[PDB]
Design a protein around this motif. Sequence first.
Motif, PDB file in Angstrom:
ATOM      1  N   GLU A  61       5.330  -0.655  19.076  1.00  0.00           N
ATOM      2  CA  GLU A  61       5.519   0.722  18.701  1.00  0.00           C
ATOM      3  C   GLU A  61       4.281   1.174  17.971  1.00  0.00           C
ATOM      4  O   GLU A  61       3.272   0.474  17.907  1.00  0.00           O
ATOM      5  CB  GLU A  61       6.765   0.936  17.808  1.00  0.00           C
ATOM      6  N   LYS A  62       4.346   2.399  17.416  1.00  0.00           N
ATOM      7  CA  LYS A  62       3.257   3.051  16.746  1.00  0.00           C
ATOM      8  C   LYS A  62       3.936   3.940  15.744  1.00  0.00           C
ATOM      9  O   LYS A  62       5.055   4.382  15.985  1.00  0.00           O
ATOM     10  CB  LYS A  62       2.451   3.874  17.774  1.00  0.00           C
ATOM     11  N   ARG A  63       3.303   4.196  14.576  1.00  0.00           N
ATOM     12  CA  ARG A  63       3.912   4.982  13.522  1.00  0.00           C
ATOM     13  C   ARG A  63       3.018   6.153  13.199  1.00  0.00           C
ATOM     14  O   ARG A  63       1.869   6.226  13.641  1.00  0.00           O
ATOM     15  CB  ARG A  63       4.121   4.180  12.212  1.00  0.00           C
ATOM     16  N   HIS A  64       3.550   7.094  12.388  1.00  0.00           N
ATOM     17  CA  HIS A  64       2.808   8.165  11.765  1.00  0.00           C
ATOM     18  C   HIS A  64       3.004   7.966  10.286  1.00  0.00           C
ATOM     19  O   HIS A  64       4.054   7.498   9.849  1.00  0.00           O
ATOM     20  CB  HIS A  64       3.341   9.571  12.164  1.00  0.00           C
ATOM     21  N   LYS A  65       1.988   8.322   9.473  1.00  0.00           N
ATOM     22  CA  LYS A  65       2.143   8.396   8.044  1.00  0.00           C
ATOM     23  C   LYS A  65       1.148   9.420   7.577  1.00  0.00           C
ATOM     24  O   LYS A  65      -0.023   9.373   7.955  1.00  0.00           O
ATOM     25  CB  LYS A  65       1.871   7.047   7.331  1.00  0.00           C
ATOM     26  N   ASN A  66       1.608  10.361   6.717  1.00  0.00           N
ATOM     27  CA  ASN A  66       0.774  11.284   5.981  1.00  0.00           C
ATOM     28  C   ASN A  66       0.232  10.497   4.809  1.00  0.00           C
ATOM     29  O   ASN A  66       0.985  10.092   3.925  1.00  0.00           O
ATOM     30  CB  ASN A  66       1.601  12.517   5.494  1.00  0.00           C
ATOM     31  N   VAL A  67      -1.096  10.244   4.806  1.00  0.00           N
ATOM     32  CA  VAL A  67      -1.771   9.580   3.714  1.00  0.00           C
ATOM     33  C   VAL A  67      -2.804  10.573   3.235  1.00  0.00           C
ATOM     34  O   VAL A  67      -3.768  10.798   3.969  1.00  0.00           O
ATOM     35  CB  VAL A  67      -2.486   8.290   4.115  1.00  0.00           C
ATOM     36  N   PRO A  68      -2.714  11.198   2.066  1.00  0.00           N
ATOM     37  CA  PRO A  68      -3.806  11.989   1.526  1.00  0.00           C
ATOM     38  C   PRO A  68      -4.873  11.052   0.993  1.00  0.00           C
ATOM     39  O   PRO A  68      -4.554   9.956   0.531  1.00  0.00           O
ATOM     40  CB  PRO A  68      -3.139  12.828   0.431  1.00  0.00           C
ATOM     41  N   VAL A  69      -6.160  11.445   1.103  1.00  0.00           N
ATOM     42  CA  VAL A  69      -7.254  10.547   0.820  1.00  0.00           C
ATOM     43  C   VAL A  69      -8.438  11.378   0.402  1.00  0.00           C
ATOM     44  O   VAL A  69      -8.732  12.421   0.982  1.00  0.00           O
ATOM     45  CB  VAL A  69      -7.564   9.604   1.984  1.00  0.00           C
ATOM     46  N   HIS A  70      -9.137  10.930  -0.664  1.00  0.00           N
ATOM     47  CA  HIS A  70     -10.226  11.649  -1.277  1.00  0.00           C
ATOM     48  C   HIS A  70     -11.512  11.299  -0.584  1.00  0.00           C
ATOM     49  O   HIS A  70     -11.728  10.145  -0.226  1.00  0.00           O
ATOM     50  CB  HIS A  70     -10.356  11.249  -2.760  1.00  0.00           C
ATOM     51  N   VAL A  71     -12.401  12.296  -0.382  1.00  0.00           N
ATOM     52  CA  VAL A  71     -13.688  12.093   0.246  1.00  0.00           C
ATOM     53  C   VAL A  71     -14.694  12.011  -0.877  1.00  0.00           C
ATOM     54  O   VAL A  71     -14.834  10.965  -1.508  1.00  0.00           O
ATOM     55  CB  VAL A  71     -14.028  13.164   1.284  1.00  0.00           C
ATOM     56  N   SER A  72     -15.414  13.117  -1.162  1.00  0.00           N
ATOM     57  CA  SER A  72     -16.439  13.161  -2.177  1.00  0.00           C
ATOM     58  C   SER A  72     -16.514  14.606  -2.601  1.00  0.00           C
ATOM     59  O   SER A  72     -15.994  15.458  -1.882  1.00  0.00           O
ATOM     60  CB  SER A  72     -17.852  12.776  -1.647  1.00  0.00           C
ATOM     61  N   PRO A  73     -17.183  14.958  -3.702  1.00  0.00           N
ATOM     62  CA  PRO A  73     -17.490  16.346  -4.041  1.00  0.00           C
ATOM     63  C   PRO A  73     -18.479  16.984  -3.086  1.00  0.00           C
ATOM     64  O   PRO A  73     -18.680  18.195  -3.159  1.00  0.00           O
ATOM     65  CB  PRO A  73     -18.098  16.260  -5.449  1.00  0.00           C
TER      66      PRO A  73
END
Lengths: 118, 80
Positions: free
Chosen positions: B35-47
């Motif tokens: 199978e395969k899943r979805h997940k909303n993961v918020p993640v910080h880049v840079s300024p």
Amino acid sequence: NYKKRLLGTAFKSSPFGGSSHAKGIVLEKLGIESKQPNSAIRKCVRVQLIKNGKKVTAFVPNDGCLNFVDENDEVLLAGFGRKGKAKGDIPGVRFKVVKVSGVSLLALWKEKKEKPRS
Amino acid sequence: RGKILTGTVVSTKMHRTIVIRRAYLHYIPKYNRYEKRHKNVPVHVSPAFRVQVGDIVTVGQCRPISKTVRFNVVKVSAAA
RNA sequence: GCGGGAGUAACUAUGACUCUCUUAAGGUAGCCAAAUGCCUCGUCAUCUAAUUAGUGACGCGCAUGAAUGGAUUAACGAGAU
RNA sequence: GAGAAUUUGGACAAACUUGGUCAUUUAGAGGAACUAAAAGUCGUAACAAGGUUUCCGUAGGUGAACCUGCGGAAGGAUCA
RNA sequence: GAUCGAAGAUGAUCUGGUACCGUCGUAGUCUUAACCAUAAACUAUGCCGACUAGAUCGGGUGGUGUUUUUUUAAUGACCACUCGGUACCUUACGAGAAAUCAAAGUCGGUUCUGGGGGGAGUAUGGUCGCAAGGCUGAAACUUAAAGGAAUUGACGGAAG
RNA sequence: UAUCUGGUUGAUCCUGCCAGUAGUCAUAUGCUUGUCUCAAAGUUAAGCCAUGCAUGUCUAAGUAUAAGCAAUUUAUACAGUGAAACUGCGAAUGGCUCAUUAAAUCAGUUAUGUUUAUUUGAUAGACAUGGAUAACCGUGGUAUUCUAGAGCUAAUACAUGCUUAAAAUCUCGACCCUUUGGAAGAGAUGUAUUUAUUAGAUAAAAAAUCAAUGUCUUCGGACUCUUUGAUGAUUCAUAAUAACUUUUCGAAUCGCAUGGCCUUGUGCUGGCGAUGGUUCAUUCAAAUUUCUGCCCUAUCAACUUGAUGGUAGGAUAGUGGCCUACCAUGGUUUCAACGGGUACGGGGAAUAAGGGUUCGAUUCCGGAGAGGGAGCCUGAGAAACGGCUACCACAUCCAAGGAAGGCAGCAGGCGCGCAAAUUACCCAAUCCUAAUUCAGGGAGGUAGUGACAAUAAAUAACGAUACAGGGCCCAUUCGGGUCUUGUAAUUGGAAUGAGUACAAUGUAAAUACCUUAACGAGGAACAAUUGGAGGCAAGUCUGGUGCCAGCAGCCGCGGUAAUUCCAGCUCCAAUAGCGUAUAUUAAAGUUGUUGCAGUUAAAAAGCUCGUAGUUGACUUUGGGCCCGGUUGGCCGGUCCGAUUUUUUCGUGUACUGGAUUUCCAACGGGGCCUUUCCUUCUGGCUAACCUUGAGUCCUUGUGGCUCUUGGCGAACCAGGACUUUACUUUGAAAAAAUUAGAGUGUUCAAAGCAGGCGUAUUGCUCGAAUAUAGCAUGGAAUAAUAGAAUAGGACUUU
């Protein structure tokens, strides 16, 4: 998950819960006949339960034809027909009446005989 | 957690933080098909903000600069 | 234009079916106490301070019945509880 | 300077009451159908080629099982 | 709307005959456009690929020999093969409960479908349809069996 | 590691459903009812509750009832330098329940931004003062709750910082200064408790380091900002990188025992124990958060604005939409959103050969709840079961003015029901709460109740003798041997469980006392019943009744000769249990993951076509990604010590077995992904492979020969090391043998071995990271130019 739609095994009993027996205040004492292969009038009672509140008919075997299980008898009701199949001669009954039991103990036992009890 | 997983960018508007979708390859126990899943993961880049939508980025733990945003992305690989 | 009299099933209770008379020869699908019912505050449930309307059926049809037609069935009104 | 009590204003949580909408249970005028059970009524449909071969689908009609139009099958022997 | 005819109207047959039979005859049957979409819609056997002895029809090649025959094109005759479809027939290994099959033996990749009979392809909702109706789709309850393959014998307005 | 039987028929074999055999249950009912140990004991109304009890404890925190003062009570050898009172600390622990919760719950594995009474380690300080106040006394208002005026009085309760005889030495900053110093303040006080660099970020007041004024000067040097911020720097903390994980913050309080010298406003000082305020640790416990895995129903398909997230402030212990204003329009979903229905979750428990299926009792761990709904305070911890306030409904008291309540704590009452126990005893033992003594505990340790179940004794069994009958071996036929459905006032007796008297023993607050021996007495293995007898399923005959009375799990039996009803005698099986009822699992390969069928029994969609999805022919490769192990971490057994012990407890190590299924790492794969060639006149130019296989040496295991058993040679398996011939682009050759030269990854840190030396350093191996045909393009070498960094030299009014 996967499975085809399986139904679990069902006892053909209109009372449920998690109880072996049940009390019931009764309506009437009947004497109904039977199906084709056998004659004789077999005795029954219209037991209405207290907890479940279902109308059932129950066979009362006894060594007393008009044994005491009256109109307003607090009779105990067991299986036999829940266990196994329902009875061939007189159908509908799949409940058998227990002797001298419950809170009040109104319904009488097997009389006029002096073999061991049951 | 440790090892660097996948993560392609879904939402891009704002400054600093984005949302990624991850995918896995798990077995469903009675099937034994994947199978395969979805997940909303918020993640910080840079300024600086160097990501676009589509970019496969290297995820890893870092500071919670928001409570849910414990992840940072350091190396951008693809561009869209 | 589309019938009468007589006899008949465990048991209270009924006539499937059968016979007989009469005439040219005796009705289906579907529905009922009517703009049509003598008999009838019929008979039953629910509603109502009483409530027969609202609404639920009963069968006890004086005298329902397919083309100057039964029946399916949405929209619209200075018209009816 | 402090405490108690009163008044005004701001923001938060939840209840209570009324109306609309949806689901479930019980009571219920009334209406349609089934299963089991002796005897009956009417016809002989099915069953041998049951003396028009049957059955299934579909359409029309009849007191009644039914009859008829049309198609097909072997569930009539043999690969029709 | 020629050729034959559900429904409908007469005659005959019979205990009855709303049928078979005979005389007539309406819708249909034909046609364009649009719709509903089913059949015991069949090989009762899904599709696709590799392993394992034995016909017929179409294509291509060969027969230093023989025949056809006067635009000789014989396309043939008749024989060897080599390929595809393969009415199919018949059969060993092998399998199966067996009849039988010749893969319906046996194998994979993938999809559909079954879990006793009656109640039921019904009830109800959703969805489609102009409407008859289609598609999806149960339970209470009843019952102790329904069913398949194969045998013997009686009987026939069956045959020898 | 798995054994099936009976019933569809005239008979047979399949298909297939049903019924039964087995193991199990907090059990329930009929019947019988004789004990014990251990364990368990409201499943229904998270319904409503009477009464008693479940929450206290210290006087070792103080004045200290002397000196002076009312009344009452207790103790003594005499003094009582007296107490039971008012204050402080716990009630958030522990116990109970699953209403609720598909959850950021919970379960695997982790992660960071915090808090933390008490406990535990270490330094310095601990001074000098002030005001009130219960208890208590005389009175006064009420039905009770609840209290009013007034007088006296202590503290570690509460609030200031006023006073400064005497007051060293050091460090730091302002005012003021002939810059020498002076006045005034704040801190410090012997020895001791991880770093560097960079990027981003909040607030009041004070201060460091500096920018922006200005002044004095013997011109050497030294002074200097209402306020404002930092180009820069300092300080606390985090992240990233150099090795990782855990822990860690904000304003004084004294009392007590003993004692020499000295001082004293007669309250110091010295020694020792203990507490409080600060500073930094540590232990224990609680928060908060990331990621993965989650039940059914699609006859539930659209849902979502404080919604996804950024910006700023506001709020918090802290991370934060925790919250608001403004801006963007996204976020979630068929890999199942959202809704509806249902449900506490795990370690675990039952059944099974295992796979699995069904459950989540007792125990243990986590969450959530305290009549209903709301809010807050107190506090380190509560938005609090036995805490508080307002509101509502119920039942209760009442002088009718008004009050007091919540058993999902223990025992018990009522109602519900198949149905489940005393209104018991106690602080000894363990553990928790308070310097110790010792007190409190309905926690707990025990007792009582019931075949509720397991377990053992088990439903009874001996040495000797007399007599009668049938069967078998042997027989010299005369008898003898072995052997038991009956029988006898038979004889010798022995034996438990329990009571009673006496002795002896251990813990006690209570109920019932244990063990051995002697003597006497009583009872007796503390009365044996229940179920079945046609087939399935061990076991038949005779009477009586006559589709009646009756039995029935299935198929059936009963209407005159009934092995099925009923009674007898006659048999079988088990037994303190036996049968029935409940329900799960096995039987069932009947929902098939392991392990199922479809020509005729139930089953291929009417047929094509094609998307998502699932699956994938093939050469050479390392890296990357993913799946799957095997090994180590916890618990149990075994090993060791004590002990009678294989009971049991404790510690250390090794081996073995089992479990939570998620992370890290190493080692070999499988599946997934990548090109003849390449600017051009012209010369055509430049360069190369993983590995396999073979040989040799060493090591391990097996077998043969030999030894009482422990030695020897060869073959073969597996592992490690060593090993080149080799491979290739090019030149010189007449061709060509042949020959000459060059190559077969790079970088960094440490540790080992290896040339020459003490080392350094180089090479190789081991381990990681990263990449895997060139000539358009990009890097390096080479040259130029611009910026930055680093090192050395020449200079410097530095």
